[PDB]
Symmetry: C3
Subunit: 347 residues, 3 copies
């Protein structure tokens, strides 16, 4: 018994769609949904998606409000669609997936993930939901998360963090650490050994190791001395070189955090979406040093150290491949006389 007015009743009275009965008066103007309260219109939803306003409204209302994998993880694993839920993409302000299963009659391709239309799609299954483990067992293509073990299946330990109503966090009152499983053409896959990005932000950056505390509290030379990093070119890769018109390096999020706390700067996020490597057009306000495409990745500094110390440094240039967030990220490594010169990602 689905209806625009009933979706709005749930948003007004429950904060989201909860399956409660009721109606409130609704107006649609431009891409915006309003409801009438004490005689005046109140905005409930502004559509920023490429879907029709009332469809986007319903999917937003029906979003998963438990901790869920970050969208970049789901993307990297090839997820096309979710079983009987909506993963809302808060970095795009839109649904993570174009179609649905058992959610919304305007976007559903099926009511259940067992229907034939779903076979070529990589369906996301949530073991926290009754019966979805068994649906993963029966599905041709899929990704499954669980909180515990699944009998017979070897797990891959996922990131510590997950997304709860658009907030990425390491749960204390709720669990955000998942096991991951994947199937392709009916065959369980070995998922690769992988690093994970930390999904932190520049302002409220918080270190997660002693090495990272030292990086943010020591001077560049004192830190490089303590961790014996001469020759790996941290001065440019991590800290950033602001002395020439073309901004040098600055590829680790922690480097930007250190800089930002000292001297602010501008980060144009010109592909606003969730992804393992982010590209920014950066302009440093103090110096005028800038760079059109500054690839930035948020690795735990210890992990980045392990990576760069695990390469052969005897060639002018080479592609270095690293599995991060279950996807292969390609880095360019440039070396001169056995020292790194630069080492930066690519999107």
């Amino acid at each position: 018994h689905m209806s625009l007015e009933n979706v709005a009743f749930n948003v007004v009275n429950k904060g989201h769609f909860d399956g409660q009965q009721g109606e409130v008066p609704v107006s649609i103007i431009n891409n915006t949904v309003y409801t009438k309260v004490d005689g005046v219109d109140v905005e409930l939803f502004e559509n920023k998606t490429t879907l029709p306003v009332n469809v986007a409204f319903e999917l937003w209302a029906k979003r998963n409000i438990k901790p869920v994998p970050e969208v970049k993880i789901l993307n990297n694993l090839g997820v096309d669609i979710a079983a009987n839920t909506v993963i809302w993409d808060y970095k795009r302000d839109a649904p993570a997936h174009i179609s649905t299963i058992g959610v919304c009659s305007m976007t559903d391709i099926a009511k259940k993930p067992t229907e034939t239309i779903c076979a070529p799609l990589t369906v996301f299954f949530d073991g926290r939901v009754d019966g979805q483990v068994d649906l993963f067992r029966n599905a041709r293509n899929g990704v499954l998360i669980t909180e515990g073990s699944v009998k017979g299946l070897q797990p891959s330990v996922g990131p510590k963090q997950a997304s709860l109503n658009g907030v990425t966090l390491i749960g204390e009152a709720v669990k955000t650490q998942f096991n991951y499983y994947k199937k392709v053409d009916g065959v369980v896959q070995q998922l690769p050994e992988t690093y994970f990005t930390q999904s932190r932000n520049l302002q409220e950056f918080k270190p997660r190791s002693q090495m990272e505390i030292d990086f943010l509290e020591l001077a560049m030379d004192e830190f490089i001395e303590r961790y014996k990093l001469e020759g790996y070119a941290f001065e440019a890769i991590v800290y950033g070189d602001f002395s020439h018109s073309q901004l040098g390096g600055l590829h680790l999020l922690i480097g930007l955090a250190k800089r930002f706390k000292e001297s602010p700067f501008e980060l144009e996020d010109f592909i606003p979406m969730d992804s393992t490597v982010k590209n920014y057009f950066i302009t440093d306000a103090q110096t005028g040093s800038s760079k059109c495409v500054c690839s930035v990745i948020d690795l735990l500094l210890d992990d980045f150290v392990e990576i760069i110390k695990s390469q052969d440094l005897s060639v002018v240039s080479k592609v270095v491949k690293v599995t991060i967030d279950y996807t292969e990220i390609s880095f360019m490594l440039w070396c001169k006389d056995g020292h790194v010169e630069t080492f930066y990602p690519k999107l």
Copy 2:
């Protein structure tokens, strides 16, 4: 001699409509009003209302720019329309009232509040304006504010604060404390004894009593000890319980302020409007504890203490009714063995 181009002339040259003569060139695209300056278009107004763009522009331009009652107060008193002014609703970014009297030919139902069409409407009258007291005396339904006494009429002392160009404040260079009066079907009403909410915000929260200073500077146990509040369950009602997936309590704005200064969190304001009780979908970034509908009220802590200490605590559950901002707010009180368990509002 009203005109779009003349409204725009006033906005460009006076900041608002002042009744000055003049025209500037104006363009309308989408819901936005532009004016031409040195050959280029400059945005003057983005329509976020459900009214036509040029109508909304004119009402915004003609908004009252003196301290006026906060919209929630006017709503709680049943005000339908204002006499010869526009109360702009800054929390909705729209007019507080759908129709006007003597303001705008597109929204006017009348030029003067004495016309017949106005009789069933509760008209807002401003005693600071010449002759509006006498119009209130003659009106069938209305609400009146004044700065001083009105001969023959018993006043109700309003909130200390009022709204000036969307800024809620307790005036020092201007007066924001009003007397209130109300008429229904030609009969002066006794207005009820009422508490008032304090209309503060979470970030720049500022305490207004010694008890509130103590609440923000002491630890939970030291504060509860000083004010002898054992058994009233402040630990959950006011301070918030973040230890389980479902966020406990947190119903007083001052509690959120204390928490926010320590550990930030997310407050989705999913019915963005002015009202005595606000509902937020809250996600605590540190713990992952969350709640879809967290009812929040900004009472002076001393007032909330008086309320909760004035209840009978011998029943498992009961509705407690409290007059706040001239409206009856219903609270749920839950008690176990003579102690409060929880006590929270409802919108």
Copy 3:
């Protein structure tokens, strides 16, 4: 070989238009440009201009990403159009000029500034670009910037600061100090002696002289004493008088910065554009003092001191004209018994 899909390819892969070959899939809905990534639409550009969405997108993409004169300077010099570039106006979120030369086939009036249609227009030429000095020499009307001397032409030293991707700054890793030249009807112009505004903002305000450091660290009376400013009415002009309903003075940006650091307030920017004098509707949150049109200018305090100390103070009221940012700004000077009473700009 221009195309919407190729402009989008450049934005996705280079941060801006770089003339690279390639296409990506593009959707246009409302005034927004999206591109398809891994099967979902991602927003690349929201049109806030009065131009068609795809045209605005292309001009934004083709914006000058080197330090360029601030738009107010170009406006004050009468610039109509730029030679073979786009000056993007970040305060309006739109092109600084309506038409182009050699940029975009939808807005071009010409491919080269030598075409006849350009003769009556004041063309902006950038000496940092090969051959534009010589085009300025041949143009009937134009403005030229250079980093160094131009043989035969006497320069005017421009502001220290310029705009780089919307960030106004004094360059250290890049040069932002330009020489300026101007021609009208084929005749080189003497540009006037001029003060320049400092283009700072209220929050992150940074002083640029010892006098300004003293102004922000001393009490009003101690500062006025040190710089012997009795009788010039700084108390109202610069510091602001918040004691009456009508806010007194507050015409220097540094005064607002001092106030803002102490007690926040509201600044409605009701003509959002770049200009030498800005008009704000200001409401002081602490006191309720307010003013519909508060003219604000960001002069180096030493420069403002020089100006006000260089006037005759023997008349009740007079217009004082001052050349700032190459334009004549008119001030009202009011004096009583040989003392300034107020002295404030006009836009």
